[PDB]
Amino acid sequence: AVCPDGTRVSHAACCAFIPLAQDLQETIFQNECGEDAHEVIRLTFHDAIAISRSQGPKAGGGADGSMLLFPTVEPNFSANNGIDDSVNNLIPFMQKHNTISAADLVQFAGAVALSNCPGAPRLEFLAGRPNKTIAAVDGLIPEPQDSVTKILQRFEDAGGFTPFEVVSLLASHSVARADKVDQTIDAAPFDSTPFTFDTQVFLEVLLKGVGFPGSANNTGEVASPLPLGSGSDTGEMRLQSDFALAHDPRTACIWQGFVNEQAFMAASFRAAMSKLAVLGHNRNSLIDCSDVVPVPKPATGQPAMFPASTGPQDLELSCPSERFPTLTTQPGASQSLIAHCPDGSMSCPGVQFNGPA
Numbered sequence: 001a002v003c004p005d006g007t008r009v010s011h012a013a014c015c016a017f018i019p020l021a022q023d024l025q026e027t028i029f030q031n032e033c034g035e036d037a038h039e040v041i042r043l044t045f046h047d048a049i050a051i052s053r054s055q056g057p058k059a060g061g062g063a064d065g066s067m068l069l070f071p072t073v074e075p076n077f078s079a080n081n082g083i084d085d086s087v088n089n090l091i092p093f094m095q096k097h098n099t100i101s102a103a104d105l106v107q108f109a110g111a112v113a114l115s116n117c118p119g120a121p122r123l124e125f126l127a128g129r130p131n132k133t134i135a136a137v138d139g140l141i142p143e144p145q146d147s148v149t150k151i152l153q154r155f156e157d158a159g160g161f162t163p164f165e166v167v168s169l170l171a172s173h174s175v176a177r178a179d180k181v182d183q184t185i186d187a188a189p190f191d192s193t194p195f196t197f198d199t200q201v202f203l204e205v206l207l208k209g210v211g212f213p214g215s216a217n218n219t220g221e222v223a224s225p226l227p228l229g230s231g232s233d234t235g236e237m238r239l240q241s242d243f244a245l246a247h248d249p250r251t252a253c254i255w256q257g258f259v260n261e262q263a264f265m266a267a268s269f270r271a272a273m274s275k276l277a278v279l280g281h282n283r284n285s286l287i288d289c290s291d292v293v294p295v296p297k298p299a300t301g302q303p304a305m306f307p308a309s310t311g312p313q314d315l316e317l318s319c320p321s322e323r324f325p326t327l328t329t330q331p332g333a334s335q336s337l338i339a340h341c342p343d344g345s346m347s348c349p350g351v352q353f354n355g356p357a
């Protein structure tokens, strides 16, 4: 087909997503892998995972836009703390681009947001999800303090995800920060390159922890290897769950396998996301609008490296059957501060709308 902008799309139904992509970029993303983009990528996951095979349809419909359709319900569950911001930022587009369902909107937005992160893959995007569903039940969102067994069971029950797919999905923590784990500090990065979709997170979680970014008494948080922060440049935080998955016999080798394996990591994430994005739907009933997802930003192609002040001596390895690669170390005696803004500064407030959530 061909859209009113000359763009030759696959199916005429996909044409509506072109104006939406432009509006999302211009209004809330500004073509960067920033705060607003990160929040949306997280929403994509919280919307999709609220489904349960064992409990049945009444428990939740998966990737159905329930967070937007029932804004006063799920956003208020403990495990969803902080999701309100992404919901309120997306509602205005729902009302505007009213030919696209809340569910399609959520998934597409995440695909657009991710394309702003260098190294991220171009996600598959299928459209046609219904604009009607039910509010999900509490307890279907995995938490930081959960054990590996509980986590793996949750993903299996949601959509038959194997442990390999679960680890692959955590590649998103390479462009993630925390605002609610510790209430004394904001935007504490999970890896040293929070604006880059690379393998640093897999490497950095394997390093010995030496301190904490803020308080040392937070549920679901463990010692970080790069806690130093000054002003707005908050230090790195480490989640119990990420730590646990990096050292459990079931997932240890998978986790290590992604260190310095950029192409493998990106492809595995794309694969796992294809499944996640259609939870609660039959993919044979959705149209393929992938050619409408923006081309992602390319990476520089540099290998993973130990950040300044850490080295091979600081690794806590758990995979006995695979050789850890030889990586270089960035020069310096002390830890460098992790930039709060992608441009380098400390002042870069994102757009935020008031809403019902």
Ligand code: HEM
Pocket (backbone or CB within 6 Å): 035, 038, 039, 041, 042, 045, 082, 142, 143, 144, 151, 169, 170, 172, 173, 175, 176, 177, 178, 179, 180, 181, 239, 241
């Ligand atoms: C065992 C599974 C997971 C757990 C327990 C978990 C936990 C968390 C926690 C505690 C935060 C901090 C939020 C805050 O306090 O502000 C976070 C952030 C985030 N997570 Fe996860 N996560 C999991 C899986 C995923 C998956 C599968 C995705 C998506 C594909 C994802 C994407 C994100 C993103 C992008 C953020 C950052 C939001 C921002 O920087 O504003 N997470 N996660």
Ligand SMILES: *[C@@H]1O[C@H](CO)[C@@H](O[C@@H]2O[C@H](CO)[C@@H](O)[C@H](O)[C@H]2NC(C)=O)[C@H](O)[C@H]1NC(C)=O
Pocket (backbone or CB within 6 Å): 069, 094, 095, 096, 097, 098, 099, 100, 101, 102, 131
């Ligand atoms: C999907 O459902 C939502 C929720 O009912 C619809 O949102 C309304 O859209 C109109 C314009 O079409 C706005 O004036 C309303 O205020 C919206 N309601 C809310 C609560 O936000 C949306 O239009 C529906 N879209 C589709 C494609 O079915």
Ligand SMILES: [Ca+2]
Pocket (backbone or CB within 6 Å): 046, 047, 048, 049, 050, 060, 061, 062, 063, 064, 065, 066, 067, 136
């Ligand atoms: Ca949902």
Ligand SMILES: [Ca+2]
Pocket (backbone or CB within 6 Å): 173, 174, 175, 191, 192, 193, 194, 195, 196, 197, 198, 199, 200, 201
């Ligand atoms: Ca990163």
Ligand SMILES: [Mn+2]
Pocket (backbone or CB within 6 Å): 038, 039, 177, 178, 179, 187
């Ligand atoms: Mn945040």
